[PDB]
Every structure is written in structure tokens, then in C-alpha cells.
Design a protein around this ligand. Structure first.
Ligand SMILES: CCOc1ccc(-c2snnc2-c2cc(Cl)c(O)cc2O)cc1
Ligand SMILES: CCOc1ccc(-c2snnc2-c2cc(Cl)c(O)cc2O)cc1
Ligand SMILES: [Mg+2]
Lengths: 209, 209
């Protein structure tokens, strides 16, 4: 049922540096995840321009942000193109080996962690705030899969048994104990307004009981 | 031999606003074109991770900048994934109808033209400096095509008879008469250093006799 994989050495090194480096401006993780949702939304939009049946798995193109203080999770849902199993295994659709190398060289030429998305590896900034990340994804070709990792060098992939998602990607951030500010409505609103004001899909921040 | 197409009304409106709006910071066109080359380079890199034969049409992943003062052209060449004929017709692989709408709304909510790439339509910033743009492209699936437009509502596509390119995209900017600074070596170097310092492929600026 569950397959466990080793990250490539460079990606393990990227994740160790994100986890261990002192860096206070952690809120940029949300901009990076919302940007990857926007890129995935743009891909299904573009494919649907020539094949409208690609939206038979959901016509609405949007992003939901769902805090849960009881579970200590922040979930980012989109209805973008989704990832195949192969793309999930292959670093969640990114060019992460080469992007890591360039990001390292840049951190040497003075860059800072907030520039991670210039290297094609912004997903991994989730580990600024999450002890465990779970990525549930469904592409029109393919079945629904769950990826997960608490870092430490490995990740798992399984066929997902949760709720069907139609099409798209859900990123569940299991927050570190000192990072619960990212469940607060005022804090999430301030970060989306500062860094994702011009994203071209609706972003709905859910509220809690 | 030559097919002529109308731009969609929103894209014609995007190009008219880029051509007619007073806006002095025209040099951002180069960052936008070099970013689209980087995205195309990332796509063939990612595809080659699971199918190395995709690089049988050229192993090196790079960007060349070629000024020609005699022809008044600046050419941007990359060896990225290339575009099919369909993608060229469909706004050079972009979601340009919806990106235009969001860029317009943003220019209302105070944004400026330099933010065009946040709307997925940075290509069209070429018309800040070019009277005519020619896009020659070759994808592994497909033949080599040339797209061209001097704005005014239409573009052409033909099978290209120039030099074979192996794989990738060449953007030829036929500069406006008052925009020849963008052929000067010191000027191009200053713009790549200011805005494309962290692009993860080599950028070679060619020199002239
Ligand atoms: C350089 C960006 O590369 C990217 C960007 C997005 C993707 C894709 S395709 N399907 N889902 C995602 C996705 C992935 C993540 Cl991690 C996410 O947070 C949200 C998503 O919708 C693949 C590569
Ligand atoms: C939002 C970016 O969307 C993009 C970005 C790049 C592409 C692609 S696929 N093949 N070539 C290009 C390309 C296109 C242009 Cl115009 C260029 O200047 C250089 C290129 O290599 C398609 C959509
Ligand atoms: Mg981008």
C-alpha cells in the first residue's frame, strides 16, 4: 500500500538548510504555495482552451485556505491541473536538483531564503513552518495520490483514500508548535494581502467554529 | 503558405495599451522574455529527467542574446521545450485572455506595466521596444514555425524556412527607431545584471563586428 522513497541528496540538503537556518521571515511559505497553485490553475485553464472536457472534473478555478486549530493544520486547496504519481515522485513536478544547486550558489552570492521561488523549489519553503507536509493530488489522467514527508531524508506515496477531490492539489501543513500564528485569520489575511494580492483566481479564507 | 489570424479582442487591447501608454521603464521587456526562456528551459529539463532522448535535439540548455545594429534587431534564443503550432496560435502558450483581464483590473488598482509578468502575459511587453516581433519555435513533436506580428490586430504563422534550430524558441525584436539602446553591449549587460542575475541557465551576450 505505502511506498517509501529517498529524496535525492540535493533535495535532502535543501530541506535541511530550510529547517536548520535561522531565518525569521517564514511567512513567505504561503506566497510560494499560492504561486504553485496559480501555476497549476493556469495549466488546466490553458489545456481547457482547446479541450473543454478537461473541466468535466470541475469548472471552478480557485484556491481555498483552510486553517484548523484543533488539528494544527493549514491546508491550501486548489482545483488546478493536478500531478500524476510520476510527477509527485519526481519532486512534485519541479526541477529540484538543478534548482537546489542554483539556490545554494545564490545563497553564497548573498541571496536570502525568500528568493527560493526564483530557483523553482518554493514548495520546500513549507518546511519553514510545517513539521510534516501532506500533498494530495488528482490529475484527470490518473488516480488520487497522497505524498507525505516529515523530512529526514524520505517521503511516502500511496493511493489516497480520503475524500475525492475532483481535480487539483491539496497541501496540508502540519504546523510546528511555535508556528500557530499561521492559523489566525488576521495573520493569513495580512500575508495574502502583502504577497498574493494579484493572483488571478479567487482565494477564499475559510473560518472556523 | 502564410496564415493570418486576428488576435482575440482582449489581446489586441493589451497590445494597444502597451504601445500607446506613456511608460518610461521599457527595459523590463528583456526580463520578461528571459523569464519565458527560463520557463521553457525548465520544461525540457523536467521532461528529460524521465526521457533523456528528449535532449537528442540538443543537450545544452541556455539562452543567447544577439544584437545586430545593421538589421536593428535584438534576438533572444533559447534551447527550451519549444511550442507546437497550436500553442503558438493560442497566444504563444499563455492564458492571455484571462491574464489580460486581471492585468487591466490591476492597472486600475494602481499597478504598473512592470508587473505584467504577474498576469502571465509578459511576452507582449516586447512591444514596448519592438515595432515587429518574430517568434521562430521548434518542439520535438512538430515542425519549425514562425509567428510574426506588427500589432494592429493580426499575426501570421508559417512553416519556417530559416536555419533549423534543433529545439527551442527564438524571439526576434525589430526595434523601434528610438529604442536602439537595447543593441548596446553595456546596456544589455546592465539590464541582465539588474533583473536576470539569478536565472539558472547561461546567458551569453554575443558581440558584433
Ligand atoms: C515552479 C512551480 O512548479 C510547479 C507548480 C505547480 C505544480 C503542480 S501541477 N499540479 N499541482 C501542482 C501543485 C504543486 C504544489 Cl507543490 C502546490 O503547492 C500546488 C499545486 O497545485 C507543479 C510544479
Ligand atoms: C507565463 C510564461 O508562459 C510561457 C513561457 C514560455 C513558453 C514557451 S514553450 N516554448 N517556448 C516558449 C517560449 C515563449 C516565449 Cl514568448 C519566449 O519569449 C521564449 C520561449 O522559450 C510558453 C509559455
Ligand atoms: Mg512563474
Amino acid at each position: 500500500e505505502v511506498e517509501t522513497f529517498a529524496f535525492q541528496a540535493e533535495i535532502a540538503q535543501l530541506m535541511s538548510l530550510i529547517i536548520n537556518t535561522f531565518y525569521s521571515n517564514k511567512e513567505i511559505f504561503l506566497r510560494e504555495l499560492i504561486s504553485n497553485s496559480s501555476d497549476a490553475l493556469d495549466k488546466i485553464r490553458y489545456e481547457s482552451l482547446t479541450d473543454p472536457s478537461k473541466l468535466d472534473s470541475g469548472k471552478e478555478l480557485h484556491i481555498n485556505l483552510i486553517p484548523n486549530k484543533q488539528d494544527r493544520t493549514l491546508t491550501i486547496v486548489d482545483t488546478g491541473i493536478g500531478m500524476t504519481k510520476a510527477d509527485l515522485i519526481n519532486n512534485l513536478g519541479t526541477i529540484a536538483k538543478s534548482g537546489t544547486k542554483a539556490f545554494m550558489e545564490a545563497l553564497q552570492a548573498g541571496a536570502d531564503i525568500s528568493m527560493i521561488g526564483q530557483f523553482g523549489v518554493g514548495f520546500y519553503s513549507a518546511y519553514l513552518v510545517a513539521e510534516k507536509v501532506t500533498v494530495i493530488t488528482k490529475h484527470n489522467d490518473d488516480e488520487q495520490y497522497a505524498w507525505e514527508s516529515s523530512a529526514g531524508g524520505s517521503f511516502t506515496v500511496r493511493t489516497d483514500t480520503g475524500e475525492p477531490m475532483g481535480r487539483g492539489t491539496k497541501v496540508i501543513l502540519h504546523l510546528k508548535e511555535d508556528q500557530t500564528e499561521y492559523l489566525e485569520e488576521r495573520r493569513i489575511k495580512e500575508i495574502v494581502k502583502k504577497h498574493s494580492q494579484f493572483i488571478g483566481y479567487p482565494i477564499t479564507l475559510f473560518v472556523e467554529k
